[PDB]
């Protein structure tokens, strides 16, 4: 139908344990629709949930795409973002879901409450439809045990774990995406404008980073990069996905025969147009690489995109 | 491991047995593995039995939730295990019923 | 002997505060007025020995006791790694793979 879905009220808000985990998580949850405003979210997020506004703001997009990580590329990656949101209070938006780059961080947040104090606010916006439990959690204002374990055949991947508070963006349908990522651009801009404590004169910061990904990850870089206040991009070269032909793009600029690839669709299409946008605007990408280049840090990268 | 190509769950009892855990965490969990239901809850049964801590710590790190693994018939088998070390909860069961249980007597939580 | 004379002292303070928390008010001179008062009511601890709180508090106090064992087993881990000992056998483990 034509997105015909009666806007009864929400009926689940409070907050979940995760049972069979690891560890004992408390997380806040708030379903809500795909056409609030971010005013509104950002009211909530405030005064309900009692968190501050942030100094800095990170943006992590991937591939939902389950996919693997070299060793030591995952551990210094972790490692350096667990810094960069840690020395300085931050906020990092994630897709919610325990798929692909979501539980490479979920992994490295378990590392970081192993061996230091602390809390981060971490804020996954997920959609409503792709939970295995759409019940289990519709107890207003109440806890609601949550369970960890997954199958393969659920179709619909649990929330992942180690992630304070949540956001669950409906708009009817179950086991398909792309309800939240208006909401999640439009809250991003909403936060961006919001004035921080100092009296200059500047909002608060906001940096993407991106890890493997896929084709819509270079039209993600592509809508950041030509938005008017313009937003610094960090991409990681040994994901091996559209971040590597990212890095790839970003040596010997301004080698057609090397854009043969393949691992999106047959030779015949190509995004050339959109890559050699993102060549042209390419002073605001900084690419992060083990010995090859400078920052060998991710705490270093991220921060001096700022 | 890879010789005998079985089910995880054989795998599992395999190192399980062999009271080797790091064999298990990195050969065993895996990108995968698909576990059959009712396996892990089975397994974490097994290794209560036997005393292995590291074990027990790493299915619950995997998953396996306490509260809905526990339940009345499962602490009954716990109590009634043979497999482990010596224990003195048989001769206080003695002394408290006064020796008038007949030899194999099944506890009971009532007992305990 | 001191020491624990002190010790033995400071446990039982308990027991005389138990003693005479039980006690009737009446001194034993004049305890034969209370001490029939229960002759007649036999055929008719808020606090001291206990303290009861409702459900949130109960909670909220098992939350704080949550926190304080994760920050005591966090404490004690981060004391032994930092430790002489545990920093010299680290080193000389990690020399002498290096070394090979």
């Given at each position: 139908?034509?997105?015909h879905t009666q806007l009864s009220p929400t009926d689940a808000f409070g907050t979940i344990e995760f049972q069979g985990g690891g560890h004992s998580n408390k997380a806040m949850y708030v379903r809500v629709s795909f056409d609030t405003?971010?005013?509104?979210?950002?009211?909530?997020?405030?005064?309900?949930?009692?968190?501050?506004?942030?100094?800095?703001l990170i943006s992590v997009h991937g591939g939902l795409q389950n996919f693997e990580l070299q060793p030591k590329l995952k551990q210094v990656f972790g490692k350096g973002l667990i810094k960069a949101a840690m020395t300085t209070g931050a906020w990092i938006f994630t897709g919610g879901v325990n798929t692909g780059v979501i539980r490479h961080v979920g992994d490295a947040l378990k590392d970081h409450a192993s061996k230091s104090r602390g809390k981060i606010c971490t804020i996954g916006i997920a959609p409503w439809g792709i939970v295995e439990n759409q019940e289990d959690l519709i107890g207003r204002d109440v806890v609601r045990p949550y369970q960890t374990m997954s199958n393969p055949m659920s179709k619909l991947t649990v929330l992942n774990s180690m992630h304070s508070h949540f956001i669950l963006a409906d708009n009817?349908?179950?086991?398909?995406?792309?309800?939240?990522?208006?909401?999640?651009?439009?809250?991003?801009?909403?936060?961006?404008?919001?004035?921080?404590?100092?009296r200059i004169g500047q909002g608060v910061p906001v940096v993407a980073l991106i890890v493997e990904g896929g084709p819509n990850v270079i039209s993600i870089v592509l809508e950041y990069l030509r938005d008017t206040p313009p937003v610094p991009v960090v991409v990681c070269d040994g994901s091996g996905r559209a971040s590597d032909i990212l890095a790839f793009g970003h040596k010997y600029s301004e080698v057609t025969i090397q854009k043969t690839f393949t691992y999106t669709r047959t030779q015949a299409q190509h995004l050339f147009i959109i890559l050699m946008e993102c060549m042209k605007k390419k002073e605001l990408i900084t690419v992060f690489r083990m010995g090859s280049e400078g920052h060998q840090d991710i705490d270093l990268a991220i921060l001096t995109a700022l | 491991l890879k010789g005998a190509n079985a089910s995880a769950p054989d795998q599992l009892s395999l190192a399980l047995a062999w009271n080797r855990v790091d064999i298990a965490r990195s050969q065993i969990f895996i990108y995968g593995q698909q576990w059959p239901v009712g396996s892990l809850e089975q397994a974490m049964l097994d290794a209560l039995v036997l005393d292995r801590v590291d074990f027990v710590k790493l299915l619950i790190e995997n998953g396996v939730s306490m509260h809905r693994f526990l339940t009345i018939s499962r602490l009954e088998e716990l109590y009634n295990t043979r497999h482990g070390p010596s224990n003195t909860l048989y001769h206080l069961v003695r002394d408290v019923k006064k020796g008038n249980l007949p030899p194999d007597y099944r506890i009971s939580l009532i007992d305990i | 002997v001191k020491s624990i004379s002190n010790q033995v002292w400071k446990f039982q303070r308990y027991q005389l505060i138990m003693t005479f928390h039980e006690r009737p008010v009446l001194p034993p001179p004049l305890i034969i007025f209370s001490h029939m008062t229960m002759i007649f009511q036999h055929v008719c601890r808020d606090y001291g020995l206990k303290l009861f709180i409702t459900d949130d508090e109960l909670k909220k106090v098992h939350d704080f006791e949550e926190q304080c064992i994760e920050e005591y087993f966090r404490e004690k881990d981060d004391r032994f790694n930092s430790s002489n000992d545990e920093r010299i056998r680290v080193t000389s483990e990690r020399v002498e793979n290096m070394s090979m």
């Open positions: 139908i034509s997105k405003k971010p005013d509104l979210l950002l009211h909530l997020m405030t005064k309900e949930w009692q968190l501050e506004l942030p100094k800095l009817g349908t179950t086991g398909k995406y792309g309800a939240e990522v208006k909401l999640r651009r439009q809250l991003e801009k909403h936060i961006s404008l919001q004035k921080i404590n100092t | - | -």
